[PDB]
């Protein structure tokens, strides 16, 4: 027998346990609100043909007036935002932002500090294990859409066991050719192209006829509670920016292609329910980082 698993689900590194209190959660949300105002201040400056909208926006964000010949870095808020992102990724990353500085910055604006107001849908497909008999080969490729290629070299038809975990809500399976899939003890249905499954239903058995290889494409949807201001387009951009800037460059950590893979991998790990809470705050921190750094590139 052989075991095949998705690459991104393997060994989720521990996440940080600091800056998760109510006071620090307000700071991340306040930073996101004020970092957004920097982006819109650019358009308002063009309409008014003046830098007054940007001066008001930057002064609130950085606590100093903008000056020429000085590289606009964002002041103390940018430094604090960069360091809390470092602490969220790894538990071994030092926490060097004082609480009194977090509280002072969080008082700059009034925001709703709740990070569970809304939800978002995540598209990473979890394939925990694929169990295959001796004479069959299984390969798994992809994270957003997983293509599972199975080839039967044995004499008789083989049964392949698919385990999609328990966190995902729905999983849609599509095959290159019609195939039969059923539950552990349910009878096999007629072959058809697509199947809709609930991961909590149980392990799924797929018959693999001898002959041409069969390819199954998997798509999953997962619901995670997030703050209402959460935006997947901005979080993904911030995730790439932080990786390039070296904010995640610390020993004994894993690396992921997208924030979608990172949050799903931590969800399926041990103590997953309390790990995703930290990852959500990291996403909102990365959303603020993307908007602030695009307005003030250094």
């Amino acid at each position: 027998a052989n075991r095949a698993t998705s690459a991104f689900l393997d060994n989720p590194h521990p996440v940080g346990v600091n800056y998760v209190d109510e006071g620090s959660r307000q700071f991340v949300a306040v930073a996101e609100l004020l970092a957004s105002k920097l982006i819109d201040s650019s358009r308002e400056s063009d309409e008014s043909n003046s830098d007054v909208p940007f001066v008001q926006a930057y002064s609130k964000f950085a606590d100093d007036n903008p000056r020429h010949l000085r590289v606009k870095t964002g002041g103390k808020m940018a430094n604090a935002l960069t360091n809390v992102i470092r602490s969220y990724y790894s538990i071994n990353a030092p926490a060097i932002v004082p609480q009194v500085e977090i509280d002072r910055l969080a008082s700059k604006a009034t925001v709703s500090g709740d990070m569970y107001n809304s939800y978002a849908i995540f598209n990473s497909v979890p394939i925990v294990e694929v169990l295959s008999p001796a004479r069959t080969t299984v390969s798994i490729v992809g994270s957003d859409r997983a293509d599972v290629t199975m080839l039967n070299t044995g004499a008789g038809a083989a049964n392949i066991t698919f385990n999609f975990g328990q966190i995902a809500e729905t999983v849609i399976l599509k095959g290159s050719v019609p195939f039969q899939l059923a539950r552990l003890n349910q009878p096999m249905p007629a072959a058809r192209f697509t199947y809709k499954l609930r991961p909590l239903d149980g392990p799924f058995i797929v018959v693999l006829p001898v002959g041409n290889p069969l390819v199954i494409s998997a798509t999953a949807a997962t619901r995670i509670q997030v703050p209402l201001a959460f935006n997947k387009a901005l979080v993904e951009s911030g995730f790439q920016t932080a990786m390039n800037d070296g904010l995640f460059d610390i020993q004994n950590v894993n690396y992921y292609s997208s924030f979608d893979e990172f949050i799903i991998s931590q969800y399926h790990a041990q103590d997953g329910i309390n790990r995703v809470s930290t990852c959500v705050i990291l996403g909102l921190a990365l959303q603020a980082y993307d908007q602030m750094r695009r307005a003030l590139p250094v």
Binding site: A95, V97, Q99
Partner: protein, 249 residues
């Protein structure tokens, strides 16, 4: 600076009640504590001046991650004005006051295994002055009362003759003893002598004089609170009161 200005037991314990633990902890990397180094003192000598760095200097040092380092950081803050680098302690412990850590079991910190002799030696009690030793002994007594180690505290005083003579007299559970106490614990203050803008040779003496000169500037600064002229503008909660009692005392 503010902690070094307190001159009475009542003021010192009152400051520790309102000061969280994060003020004791420093977030600067510093350097390793015990090293023989050469520093530059150009006012006196052309050659480099040898000295040994220590934990009771006014500059942050790197500290051990154990509970011993945390207590040793608290005492160094009280006697020198700066603490050490112990990161990732946690929000729950850092938000508590310094008095709560030293005196209360509800913090969740266990300190009954501490050895007063080893802590004193690591803090270089021999290099401490009279006020610094009195302040450290206050920290030891609060820890002993928390852990029910009053007998051990007395025996440690019996072994060290100079420490017994200067040991402050107060029961860590009774507020009447704190009010009566008249020991002078100030390290910085308004100087009666002539204080000049001149350097000192050793690291400890030079760093201490910086706080002394800084306190004079702080005294005349707008941040200083003048009780004689602005007592009505102070908030009632933090206004000075004759019947001032620490919680539970």
């Amino acid at each position: 600076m503010d902690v070094l200005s307190k001159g009475s037991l009542k003021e010192l314990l009152a400051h520790l009640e309102k000061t969280p633990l994060e003020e004791a902890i420093s977030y600067r990397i510093g350097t390793v504590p015990y090293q023989n180094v050469l520093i530059s003192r150009n006012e006196y000598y052309n050659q480099l001046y040898p000295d040994t760095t220590s934990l009771i200097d006014g500059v942050s040092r790197e500290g051990q991650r154990n509970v011993n380092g945390l207590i040793m950081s608290i005492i160094s803050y009280v006697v020198s004005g700066s603490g050490h680098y112990i990161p990732n302690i946690g929000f729950m412990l850092l938000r508590r006051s310094i008095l709560d850590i030293l005196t209360k079991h509800d913090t969740g910190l266990v300190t009954n295994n501490l050895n007063y002799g080893i802590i004193a030696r690591n803090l270089t009690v021999s290099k401490m002055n009279c006020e610094q030793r009195k302040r450290m002994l206050i920290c030891f007594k609060l820890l002993a009362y928390k852990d029910g180690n009053q007998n051990d505290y007395e025996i440690y005083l019996n072994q060290n003759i100079p420490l017994k003579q200067i040991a402050p007299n107060f029961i860590p559970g009774d507020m009447r003893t704190v009010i009566h106490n008249q020991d002078q614990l100030a390290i910085v203050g308004i100087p009666a002598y002539r204080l000049t803008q001149s350097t000192e040779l050793s690291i400890r003496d030079d760093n201490a004089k910086s706080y002394k000169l800084g306190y004079v500037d702080w005294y005349n600064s707008n941040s200083f609170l003048r009780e004689r002229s602005e007592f009505n503008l102070i908030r009632l909660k933090d206004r000075d009161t004759k019947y001032g009692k620490l919680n539970g005392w």
